[PDB]
Amino acid sequence: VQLVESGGGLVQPGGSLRLSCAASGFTLDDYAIGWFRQVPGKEREGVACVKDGSTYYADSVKGRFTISRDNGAVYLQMNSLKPEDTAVYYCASRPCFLGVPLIDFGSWGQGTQVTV
Amino acid sequence: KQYPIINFTTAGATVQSYTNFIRAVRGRLTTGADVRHEIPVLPNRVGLPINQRFILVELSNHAELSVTLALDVTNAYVVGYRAGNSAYFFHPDNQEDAEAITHLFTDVQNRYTFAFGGNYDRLEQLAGNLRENIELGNGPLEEAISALYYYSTGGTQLPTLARSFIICIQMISEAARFQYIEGEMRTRIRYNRRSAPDPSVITLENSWGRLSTAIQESNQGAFASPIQLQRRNGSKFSVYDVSILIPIIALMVYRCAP
Ligand SMILES: [Cl-]
Ligand SMILES: [Cl-]
Ligand SMILES: [Zn+2]
């Protein structure tokens, strides 16, 4: 897959991280992009997504996370991190709707690990 | 892709070959069992199984480049396309349609949802031109196929991609919907012309949903409310019943039971 995650790591509660979603050969501006979370033992959950004219967040992360476009990438700024935010984070081009449901095409890459 | 495929090529396209194509598209969009006041209705989305939801139009051109568009049988409109090992879909309007679209091109690893929907107002903005300034014809369709093809390898910028969608949607979906628009394309092909659509074509495209509703809610064909359209010179006129539309509109979106 072409969309690659970076920026994961270890922080303390209250802490901060910025994840990046990018492709080496093209801009992600043209695409709807979502950030999804998967904690061990479950399945991927919508965190935040962007499309033309709309941004949506999971209730869990409202007012704490921010998704945005810059540099032909899509970033997830994670603030006031809680231990409940610990997971592997994945980005993908997927539809963007209220509540960030995952409507999956099924192709994912390595993701990036976040530990609070 | 086990969805039905209809093929068309711009290499040596004729009035006849384009006619054969649009008729084939119509025949795969609907059985034609359901007709109201002489006009065929597309299948009701309610009761439509997912393995009958889409048809595929494979387009080829003089350069032997091929792309495959997917059309939704409930409204005859383009939802996305495949070129090689990539596929791309307009952002759908709701979750049910988005889920349906995951059944398209399932052997493709690289599937993408565009940030934008496929409505003309947005496609025009992205294209950098309105429909009235985008030429239609065999030349434009040839160019649109190559543009769609090279988008996955970085050779096509977004404005050219959006323009190319506007060309394909009108020459395929709108032509299937309207014999009038089919005829407008037949004239361009016949005289080896490329030219933009005039207000008579633009307002039919814009009003297709409203016309479907008016015809199906009519009293024996007489409209409860007039539908407004424009003539070729842009003057507005009103349609008050289905009889004047029988040579004009070929397919309707399902609105209610007969
Ligand atoms: Cl399913
Ligand atoms: Cl226009
Ligand atoms: Zn399904």
**Chain pair A-B, CB pairs under 8 angstroms:** 54
Largest CA distance in chain B: 53
From the CA of B102, how far away is ligand 3's center (Å)? 7
B81: which residues sit within 8 A by CB, 6+ positions away?
B67, B68, B69, B70, B87, B88, B148
Handedness of CA B101, B104, B106, B108 (dihedral sign): negative
What are the residue ranges of CATH 4.10.470.10 in chain B? 177-258
Closest by Cβ to B110, choosing from A2, A50, A94: A2
**C-alpha span between A49 and A65 (Å, rounded):** 11
Helix (H, G, I), strand (E, B) or coil at B113: strand
Q: Return residues 115-144 of B near A (CB < 8 Å).
A: 115-117, 122
**C-alpha span between A53 and B123 (Å, rounded):** 14
C-alpha closest to that of B251 among B80, B17, B3, B27: B27
Asked if A103 lies within 8 A of B91 by C-beta distance, the reply is no
What are the residue ranges of CATH 3.40.420.10 in chain B? 1-176
**C-alpha span between A106 and B13 (Å, rounded):** 38
**C-alpha span between B34 and B40 (Å, rounded):** 6
In order of start, what are the domains of chain A with their CATH numbers? Answer: 1-116 (2.60.40.10)
Within 8 A of B117 by CB-CB distance, chain A residues are 52
Tokens 């209250």 identify what position? A14
* Record: fold of B177-258: Ricin (A Subunit), domain 2 (4.10.470)
- Per the structure block, which two tokens stand in for B84? 């090689």
Q: Pick one of 3.40.420.10, 3.40.630.10, 3.40.1350.10, 3.40.190.10 as the CATH number of B1-176.
A: 3.40.420.10
**C-alpha span between A48 and B61 (Å, rounded):** 41
Q: How far is CA A45 from CA A15, A65, A103, in A?
A: 21, 14, 10
- Structure determined via: X-ray
- Final resolution, Å: 1.5
Tell whether residue B134 is among the known ligand binding residues: no
With an 8 Å Cβ cutoff, is B114 touching chain A? yes
User: What is the CA angle A3-A38-B152, rounded to 5?
Assistant: 15
Asked if B115 lies within 8 A of A1 by C-beta distance, the reply is no
**C-alpha span between A40 and A72 (Å, rounded):** 30
- Measured in degrees and rounded to the nearest 5, phi and psi for residue B246 equal -60, -35
Which stretches does DSSP call E strand in A23-72? 33-38, 45-51, 54-57, 65-70
Q: Respond yes or no: is residue B96 known to be catalytic.
A: no
User: What is the CA angle B56-B201-B150, rounded to 5?
Assistant: 40
Q: Which of B77, B149, B151, B254 is catalytic?
A: B77
- Distance from first CA to last CA of chain B, Å, rounded? 32
Q: How many CB atoms lie within 10 A of CB B171?
A: 28
Burial classification of residue B73, based on how many CB atoms lie within 10 Å of its CB (0-12 exposed, 13-18 middle, 19 or more buried): buried
- Per the structure block, which two tokens stand in for B104? 């398209």
**Are the C-beta atoms of residues A46 and A102 closer than 8 Å to each other?**
yes
Closest by Cβ to B98, choosing from A31, A95, A106: A95
With an 8 Å Cβ cutoff, is B255 touching chain A? no
Q: Which of B120, B149, B151, B254 is catalytic?
A: B120
Breaks (C-N over 2.5 A) in chain A follow: none
A52: which residues sit within 8 A by CB, 6+ positions away?
A32, B91, B115, B116, B117, B122
Tell whether residue B254 is among the known ligand binding residues: no
Identify the residue among A68, A93, A100 best suited for mutation to test binding to B, counting B beta carbons within 10 A and taking the highest.
Answer: A93
Q: Which residues of B179-195 are buried (b: 16+ CB within 10 A; e: fewer)?
A: bbbbebbbebbeeeebe
With an 8 Å Cβ cutoff, is A94 touching chain B? yes
Closest by Cβ to B95, choosing from A52, A101, A104: A101
Long-range contacts of B128-132 (CB under 8 A, 24+ apart): B128/B159, B128/B162, B128/B163, B129/B163, B131/B166, B131/B170, B131/B196, B131/B197, B131/B202, B131/B205, B132/B196, B132/B197, B132/B198, B132/B199, B132/B202
**Are the C-beta atoms of residues B70 and B25 closer than 8 Å to each other?**
no
